[PDB]
Design a binder for this molecule. Sequence first.
Ligand SMILES: [Zn+2]
Lengths: 134, 638
Amino acid sequence: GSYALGPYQISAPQLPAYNGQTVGTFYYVNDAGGLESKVFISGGPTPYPNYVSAGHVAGQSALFMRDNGISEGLVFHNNPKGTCGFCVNMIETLLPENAKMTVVPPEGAIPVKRGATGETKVFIGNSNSPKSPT
Amino acid sequence: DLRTLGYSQQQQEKIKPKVRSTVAQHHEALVGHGFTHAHIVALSQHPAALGTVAVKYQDMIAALPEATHEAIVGVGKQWSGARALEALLTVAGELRGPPLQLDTGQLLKIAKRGGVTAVEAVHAWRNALTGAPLNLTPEQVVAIASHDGGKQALETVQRLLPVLCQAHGLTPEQVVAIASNGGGKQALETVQRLLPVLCQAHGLTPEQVVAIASNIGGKQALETVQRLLPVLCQAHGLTPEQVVAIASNNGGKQALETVQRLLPVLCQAHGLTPEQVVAIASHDGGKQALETVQRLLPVLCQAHGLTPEQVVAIASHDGGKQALETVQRLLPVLCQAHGLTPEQVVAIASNGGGKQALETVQRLLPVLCQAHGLTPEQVVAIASNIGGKQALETVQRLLPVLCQAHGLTPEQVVAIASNNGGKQALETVQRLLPVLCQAHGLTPEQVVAIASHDGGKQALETVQRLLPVLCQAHGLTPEQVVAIASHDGGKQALETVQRLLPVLCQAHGLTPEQVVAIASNNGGKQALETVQRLLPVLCQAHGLTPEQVVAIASNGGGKQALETVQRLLPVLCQAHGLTPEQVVAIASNGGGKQALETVQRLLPVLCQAHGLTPEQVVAIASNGGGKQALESIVAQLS
DNA sequence: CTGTGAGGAAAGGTAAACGGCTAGGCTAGATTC
DNA sequence: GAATCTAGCCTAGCCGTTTACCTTTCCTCACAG
Ligand SMILES: [Zn+2]
């Protein structure tokens, strides 16, 4: 994507790895123009080990966006395969009442498994709460 | 004068003025013999029959032990009522022996439908009829001599069967079918006179000519076809099959003339494709339907909604004029007082005899809704079939008895009655439920499932007749018999299975479960016959195994699928690069013939103008609903 | 070194719905001898 | 009058094809015994 407002243009630096887990970026602002990728790479300790999306790279936003970001969201990905099908669903619950999701690089346009659609949707506005483990 | 005897005003008005004295004379004797007032009123079209029945009745019962009052009244009210009975009192004894073993019902039917002349004609020439060179079974003789105009078809058959069967060349059953209708002598003579001319100049096959001449009113469709085929095929741009279909019904001459007169007017002023006109004019009373459509299309399409497609749908059945007039008369009162949508009324009226169904619905909606507790949707579903009036009248009478004396829910009764011929199914269930439940060990649910289909009465009778023999001598569980008998045409499937199981299981190496799977669908008899005919051809000429043939045939319309596979395997495998497994996969679902034709028609386009490989279109077509996806999801959106 | 949770998508599978044909009966009016 | 020929209108039974509503799979960028 190349469209967004606020004190920043719309582009991300890419890291070609092909190995490892994932590299991602984020662009969020609450009251200042401060923003960074927040060194999000893969899954670590999260208070939701039961939801598979909680260890995927996109789903990690829930933590620190439910806490801080009622605003929209911007992401870019370094895995050129496509957005997992587990996060096409299952992602809408784990945000506040309204938020936005963004696009993946054009390289990840060769999906082989179920789901995995390119140029992911905005992923706006579901109303239920993430469920407590156990 | 007849009021003292106890006749109502309407009954007195029905009787002709000059025959009331005869009723006042022979009323006491008839009442003593056990006749009702309605029977006496009906037995007055023939005044001379009253004295014959009153004086000679014990002899009638002695000669015809099983005869009832209704049969005697029906026989003795026609144009030859007295003389037919007086000949039945003298020929019945000789007609019951050889060569024709005739029962009471056949004698009564032949008398009532043919008269004294037919009775004596059958009595005289029985030896010549049953013997060489004719060799006619008694059933064929009864069928021929049971029409108004008999004693003339028999002599014509005797004189013309060898000539027609030797020179022109026709199967004797074809001649019998031609001669088994009113005015069959004229039909036979006209066929003999006009068959070569129609088969040589106009290029018609003999089967079509026989089909035209196998209807009451022949000798008029053949000459009209001969006169009007070229002008219809040239000026109006039609096809010979359409003309044959138009002329292959009762009064086809009138239909042909009306089509010639009114095709341009309907195709220009109103707006209607010629196919719709042909569909309208392809039923009995076609000219009436055409003229009524021309008269009533604008008013119904403007003042009552009712798009022209619905009007054409209504008018495309036998008696389509009465249905249109009844719809025009009863749409407002039915949609304004009983709370019914116009689509429901159209669905009710789009069947044979829809006027009676509409009248019965108007008469019986409130009583059924407020005395038995039925939703209007249930009544509409009951009344939306052929003969729905009888179904409604039978439900109104037999609902409480079946719901109390047999422990059946109203939903089951509604499901039984919501089918063609549902009047007979309810009576058969009432008669045969205890016997089937006690003497054979069947639950009521199985009986209801057997009876909840078209022709369920025959299915129940066949199940009762054939359950022990199939269960004991062939090693079949009762569940398999129920599964076979559940579908439409269960009697035919059961008979075909009983006839064809051993040779299929022995000469072809098929297991009984495969036969059960083949015969457990609509039209399973045709599938069984086609499999028996085509298994060795498909397994040797082409590379196939019996499992693939069984999979193809284990579906609705398996005969068509098998024939289409046989026709289209080399064409698809030698021009489009498809392996036989893929062709089998395409054809192993419902509507497989259409799927194969669509794939053949649409593969080049989807391969040269959309960027799709063959395996992808095969995968789309391999699932149920292949024509819809290939024809309107991948070929119209782009 | 091979087998585990939440959440709406597509996809097999049986039944219900929607068309069209064939065989047989009964009544009223017209036509021929 | 005595027999026979023509048109319409109603009930049952059988054979093919398309559509609406349930239920059994498939999906990782994680990890444990
Ligand atoms: Zn994911």
